[PDB]
Amino acid sequence: NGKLFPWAQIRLPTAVVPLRYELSLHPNLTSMTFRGSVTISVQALQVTWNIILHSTGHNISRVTFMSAVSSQEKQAEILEYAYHGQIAIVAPEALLAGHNYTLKIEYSANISSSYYGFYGFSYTDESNEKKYFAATQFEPLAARSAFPCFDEPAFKATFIIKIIRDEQYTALSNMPKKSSGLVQDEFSESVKMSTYLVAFIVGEMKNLSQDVNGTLVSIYAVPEKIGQVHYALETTVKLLEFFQNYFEIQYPLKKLDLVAIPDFEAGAMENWGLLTFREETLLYDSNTSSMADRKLVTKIIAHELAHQWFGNLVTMKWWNDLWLNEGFATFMEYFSLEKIFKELSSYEDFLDARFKTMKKDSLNSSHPISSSVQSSEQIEEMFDSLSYFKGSSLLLMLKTYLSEDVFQHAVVLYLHNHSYASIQSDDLWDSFNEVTNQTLDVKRMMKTWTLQKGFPLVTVQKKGKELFIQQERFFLYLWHIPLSYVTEGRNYSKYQSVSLLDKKSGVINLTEEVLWVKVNINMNGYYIVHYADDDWEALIHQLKINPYVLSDKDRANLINNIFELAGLGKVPLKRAFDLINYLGNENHTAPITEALFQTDLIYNLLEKLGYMDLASRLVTRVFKLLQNQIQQQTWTDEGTPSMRELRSALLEFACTHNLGNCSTTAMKLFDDWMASNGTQSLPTDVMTTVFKVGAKTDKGWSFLLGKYISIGSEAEKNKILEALASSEDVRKLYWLMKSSLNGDNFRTQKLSFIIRTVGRHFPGHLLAWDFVKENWNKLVQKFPLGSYTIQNIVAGSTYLFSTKTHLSEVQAFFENQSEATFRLRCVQEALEVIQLNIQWMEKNLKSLTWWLRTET
Ligand SMILES: *[C@@H]1O[C@H](CO)[C@@H](O[C@@H]2O[C@H](CO)[C@@H](O[C@@H]3O[C@H](CO)[C@@H](O)[C@H](O)[C@@H]3O)[C@H](O)[C@H]2NC(C)=O)[C@H](O)[C@H]1NC(C)=O
Ligand SMILES: N[C@H]1CCSSC[C@@H](C(=O)NCc2ccccc2CC(=O)O)NC(=O)C[C@H](Cc2ccc(O)cc2)NC1=O
Ligand SMILES: *[C@@H]1O[C@H](CO)[C@@H](O[C@@H]2O[C@H](CO)[C@@H](O)[C@H](O)[C@H]2NC(C)=O)[C@H](O)[C@H]1NC(C)=O
Ligand SMILES: *[C@@H]1O[C@H](CO)[C@@H](O[C@@H]2O[C@H](CO)[C@@H](O)[C@H](O)[C@H]2NC(C)=O)[C@H](O)[C@H]1NC(C)=O
Ligand SMILES: *[C@@H]1O[C@H](CO)[C@@H](O[C@@H]2O[C@H](CO)[C@@H](O)[C@H](O)[C@H]2NC(C)=O)[C@H](O)[C@H]1NC(C)=O
Ligand SMILES: *[C@@H]1O[C@H](CO)[C@@H](O)[C@H](O)[C@H]1NC(C)=O
Ligand SMILES: *[C@@H]1O[C@H](CO)[C@@H](O)[C@H](O)[C@H]1NC(C)=O
Ligand SMILES: *[C@@H]1O[C@H](CO)[C@@H](O)[C@H](O)[C@H]1NC(C)=O
Numbered sequence: 042n043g044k045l046f047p048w049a050q051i052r053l054p055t056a057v058v059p060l061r062y063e064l065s066l067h068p069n070l071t072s073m074t075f076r077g078s079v080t081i082s083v084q085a086l087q088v089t090w091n092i093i094l095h096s097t098g099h100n101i102s103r104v105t106f107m108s109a110v111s112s113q114e115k116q117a118e119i120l121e122y123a124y125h126g127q128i129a130i131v132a133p134e135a136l137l138a139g140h141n142y143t144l145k146i147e148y149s150a151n152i153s154s155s156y157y158g159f160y161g162f163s164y165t166d167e168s169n170e171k172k173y174f175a176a177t178q179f180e181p182l183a184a185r186s187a188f189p190c191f192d193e194p195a196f197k198a199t200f201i202i203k204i205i206r207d208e209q210y211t212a213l214s215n216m217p218k219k220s221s222g223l224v225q226d227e228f229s230e231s232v233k234m235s236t237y238l239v240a241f242i243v244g245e246m247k248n249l250s251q252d253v254n255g256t257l258v259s260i261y262a263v264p265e266k267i268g269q270v271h272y273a274l275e276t277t278v279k280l281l282e283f284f285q286n287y288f289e290i291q292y293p294l295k296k297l298d299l300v301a302i303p304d305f306e307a308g309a310m311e312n313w314g315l316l317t318f319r320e321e322t323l324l325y326d327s328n329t330s331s332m333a334d335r336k337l338v339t340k341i342i343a344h345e346l347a348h349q350w351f352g353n354l355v356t357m358k359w360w361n362d363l364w365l366n367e368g369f370a371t372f373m374e375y376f377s378l379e380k381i382f383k384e385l386s387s388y389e390d391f392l393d394a395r396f397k398t399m400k401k402d403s404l405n406s407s408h409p410i411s412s413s414v415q416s417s418e419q420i421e422e423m424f425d426s427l428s429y430f431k432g433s434s435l436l437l438m439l440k441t442y443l444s445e446d447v448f449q450h451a452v453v454l455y456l457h458n459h460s461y462a463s464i465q466s467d468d469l470w471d472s473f474n475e476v477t478n479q480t481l482d483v484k485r486m487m488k489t490w491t492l493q494k495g496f497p498l499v500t501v502q503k504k505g506k507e508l509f510i511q512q513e514r515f516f517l518y519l520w521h522i523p524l525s526y527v528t529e530g531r532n533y534s535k536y537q538s539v540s541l542l543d544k545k546s547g548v549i550n551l552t553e554e555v556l557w558v559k560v561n562i563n564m565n566g567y568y569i570v571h572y573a574d575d576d577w578e579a580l581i582h583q584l585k586i587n588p589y590v591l592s593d594k595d596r597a598n599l600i601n602n603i604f605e606l607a608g609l610g611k612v613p614l615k616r617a618f619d620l621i622n623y624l625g626n627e628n629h630t631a632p633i634t635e636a637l638f639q640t641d642l643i644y645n646l647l648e649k650l651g652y653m654d655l656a657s658r659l660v661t662r663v664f665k666l667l668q669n670q671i672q673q674q675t676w677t678d679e680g681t682p683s684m685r686e687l688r689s690a691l692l693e694f695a696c697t698h699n700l701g702n703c704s705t706t707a708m709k710l711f712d713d714w715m716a717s718n719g720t721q722s723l724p725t726d727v728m729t730t731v732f733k734v735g736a737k738t739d740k741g742w743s744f745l746l747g748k749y750i751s752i753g754s755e756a757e758k759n760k761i762l763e764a765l766a767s768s769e770d771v772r773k774l775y776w777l778m779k780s781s782l783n784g785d786n787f788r789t790q791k792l793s794f795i796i797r798t799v800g801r802h803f804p805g806h807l808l809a810w811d812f813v814k815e816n817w818n819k820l821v822q823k824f825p826l827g828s829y830t831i832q833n834i835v836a837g838s839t840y841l842f843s844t845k846t847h848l849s850e851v852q853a854f855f856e857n858q859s860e861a862t863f864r865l866r867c868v869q870e871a872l873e874v875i876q877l878n879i880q881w882m883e884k885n886l887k888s889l890t891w892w893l894r895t896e897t
């Protein structure tokens with residue numbers, strides 16, 4: 042390596058611009074190796090002497106420079122940096138502005154063992170013959186490893202993939218196949234699309250498909266589970282007809298292929314014409330799948346289809362605006378559901394996810410949804426709750442403040458104007474303003490939301506017939522808030538209005554002296570509202586009297602807010618618990634769960650700290666509130682989906698802390714199920730709750746383990762797995778984490794699941810953090826530093842620590858690792874989580890024992 046590399050920055054130079062890529066690769070699954078050839082059509086709009094590409098883990102043999110008048114090809118010199126995963130091609134004779142050239146590079150590499158890029162694995166059949174499968178995960182920066190390219194989403198280009206298969210496999214990609222000793226299939230040329238959407242799969246599969254008003258929707262799967270693809274096609278065809286009507290642009294490809302991958306870490310991918318999925322996520326069987334399992338497969342297919350337009354067709358210029366794709370997809374995912382799939386009551390998950398996202402956003406570790414991103418690790422952490430749900434709340438807020446129809450016009454204009462192009466944060470805002478040329482100037486209103494941390498705190502004071510509103514930052518520079526308040530008059534009549542706050546303080550005029558208010562119409566706004574004690578007390582009385590004047594979304598938003606507010610010390614803890622006394626008149630799921638999550642969170646914290654006494658006192662008092670609702674629950678899979686998951690939460694809550702007869706009944710059902718060798722029908726809703734009880738027995742634990750290896754229902758196994766990991770035998774728990782990590786018997790994709798479940802409860806609480814801590818570099822090899830997977834793990838096992846001593850060790854451990862690792866958001870956020878737990882223990886623990894006492 043004589044001369045040094047010609048580029049000294051992370052981001053690619055803009056002189057070179059690709060037009061067309063030819064990727065012809067030949068892979069041997071036996072040795073986990075392949076040979077690939079990349080032909081790139083490149084136009085240089087700048088006078089340059091050097092060409093730079095992203096490339097890693099590659100054996101390069103020969104490169105060609107060939108755009109001379111009659112020259113066939115010329116040999117060239119390749120240079121590699123490798124710190125930035127970049128390679129430089131010193132082309133002879135400088136490229137001229139506007140002149141097209143063609144670069145072909147020859148290389149060899151290995152199939153990776155990590156869950157990233159081009160990877161392969163071996164899975165076992167029903168007939169028990171080992172088979173191999175190859176898949177693609179290029180998003181976000183894994184294309185570099187696969188083939189040498191301009192690995193940046195703004196460098197859109199056309200792609201033609203030529204792939205070779207070993208026997209008579211299924212070779213699939215973005216475009217349909219037309220190729221006729223081993224066979225070589227060449228897929229057709231595709232739309233100008235980014236490099237990270239390139240996808241190709243190689244394995245033994247079968248196909249179930251239907252025509253959808255011109256296009257062929259194919260849902261592929263491994264021969265074993267091809268019967269379980271019936272539900273996916275039903276929804277996929279229904280959704281595509283729905284999405285094509287609300288975005289008048291129709292699907293641009295001849296074939297839409299959704300595939301169920303045996304392993305695969307991410308829930309699903311959006312690769313144009315090749316939706317890659319998790320087998321647990323795409324497959325479904327009514328007999329063995331729960332209501333939540335039916336809801337999970339519906340939303341992911343809804344979420345994946347939205348990307349076809351948001352991200353595939355029109356995508357972000359750079360990841361610092363990644364919320365411009367996932368934020369839109371998540372919004373469009375739950376919006377689509379609410380119109381064509383209202384039965385599912387999918388608003389609940391969106392609410393809960395926003396409640397959980399708002400807590401992470403409120404921390405000082407949070408960043409703006411449009412935030413400067415430079416390092417590779419900085420890019421990897423962009424796939425967090427904010428991008429999915431703070432970008433999704435931002436979109437939701439606009440739809441409610443503005444009209445529903447206007448949103449369609451802003452959406453449709455946005456897609457056509459920027460089709461097959463890179464967009465920015467500001468590009469999206471003009472589109473709203475373009476269709477609405479009034480005094481709105483959206484880009485100024487949304488500049489506050491997209492350029493700063495957190496959300497506002499709306500403090501509401503009512504004196505007489507005036508509503509006093511002030512906006513404050515949330516912690517333990519000014520936004521434009523769309524306030525929406527629901528008032529009840531003295532004749533108890535419904536009346537609702539909306540106002541916009543662009544100032545720190547405000548006063549809203551009321552028509553008549555009211556009984557109470559609600560300051561956020563449902564959730565709908567990305568902010569937290571605090572009320573005056575009397576106004577807070579007014580809400581509690583109404584709730585104690587009749588809770589149905591409010592919504593379930595409106596009543597569970599009150600619970601999340603009061604506890605969040607109670608946690609940080611703004612308002613005394615008792616008043617938060619004082620509100621949750623209306624549970625007797627409560628039959629809806631969203632208020633019940635958010636109360637249960639708030640109580641379940643508190644109990645887990647105390648249990649860790651040795652306060653066994655206080656913890657059970659808490660779940661007792663809550664059990665007595667919900668004793669009526671809990672006791673009338675039937676183990677029968679009966680009721681409209683929201684009712685079905687309403688059952689599981691209560692059955693889980695009673696059984697997890699050994700309350701009532703839940704354990705008594707579940708033991709009997711499990712014995713019935715076990716003494717039937719798994720043949721006997723056991724209801725989908727109560728399966729996980731029964732499995733948890735069955736796993737307490739060593740025989741039950743061992744019997745279940747035999748089923749997990751034995752059965753093929755992925756949805757039923759993840760229910761069983763939750764039972765094994767909820768076991769209290771630390772020796773059993775440790776083994777589960779070691780198995781997935783190495784991948785024997787347990788697939789590595791569950792490692793985050795097992796580590797998170799192990800760390801929740803007292804046995805294995807220390808075990809989970811230590812296994813993450815002591816196996817950390819093996820974990821960084823499997824999932825990149827900054828990845829959701831590794832950020833999920835850190836947060837999954839560190840949220841229940843509440844001690845300054847514990848805070849000192851997590852902080853010290855990451856110091857021991859590296860400066861790149863210690864500056865990570867996951868380390869910084871999860872350490873701050875522990876901090877707040879110290880304070881919550883400080884401010885409310887002492888008093889909590891006061892309301893939690895038996896007074897003579
Ligand atoms: C279709 O797409 C084009 C390109 O995205 C849109 O053009 C954009 O229009 C906005 C209007 O606000 C321009 O923003 C302006 O920027 C200057 C300074 O940079 C500022 O002085 C103005 O007050 C305003 O902020 C924006 O520049 C322009 N795009 C580009 C690339 O310049 C167009 O509005 C879209 N909609 C249609 C044509 O209906
Ligand atoms: N951006 C692309 C992919 C880039 S990788 S994102 C990180 C990774 C991930 O782990 N998700 C959570 C998850 C989901 C299923 C099983 C396990 C786990 C992790 C756990 O067990 O905790 N996959 C995704 O999130 C898929 C999500 C699309 C999506 C679908 C359904 C939704 O309801 C929301 C969102 N992502 C995209 O389209
Ligand atoms: C990859 O290499 C393996 C061997 O290392 C090939 O597998 C066998 O190859 C021999 C000769 O090519 C055949 O006679 C066998 O029947 C093959 N059987 C099995 C089960 O693999 C394999 O064909 C090669 N594949 C590619 C795509 O190159
Ligand atoms: C019962 O409540 C309703 C809620 O709409 C009252 O209707 C309006 O009340 C406000 C406040 O007094 C007035 O400003 C409006 O003009 C009322 N609407 C009319 C008059 O059409 C309603 O008036 C209440 N019933 C009464 C006062 O008898
Ligand atoms: C209970 O079910 C298991 C499978 O979960 C049975 O074990 C397999 O049975 C098949 C036939 O169904 C045999 O061909 C295999 O040899 C068995 N596998 C193993 C690992 O032993 C089992 O026979 C069923 N009943 C009992 C009482 O064991
Ligand atoms: C994988 O391939 C790369 C590129 O050819 C090569 O450097 C390396 O020796 C192979 N694998 C590992 C883990 O070393
Ligand atoms: C790369 O190719 C060269 C030349 O064919 C060879 O000597 C070397 O072993 C190859 N590297 C790998 C990792 O296969
Ligand atoms: C390269 O081909 C494109 C095809 O779109 C054409 O626009 C361009 O004129 C060609 N290059 C030059 C320097 O003209």
Ligand SMILES: *[C@@H]1O[C@H](CO)[C@@H](O)[C@H](O)[C@H]1NC(C)=O
Pocket residue numbers: 248249250251
């Ligand atoms: C699988 O693909 C073929 C390709 O022609 C198609 O005709 C067939 O209908 C598909 N199989 C089904 C729907 O079972």
Ligand SMILES: *[C@@H]1O[C@H](CO)[C@@H](O)[C@H](O)[C@H]1NC(C)=O
Pocket residue numbers: 668672701702
């Ligand atoms: C079983 O549930 C009922 C429902 O009220 C409860 O009263 C009873 O105490 C439970 N059985 C126990 C605790 O043994």
Ligand SMILES: [Zn+2]
Pocket residue numbers: 311344348367370
């Ligand atoms: Zn997504």
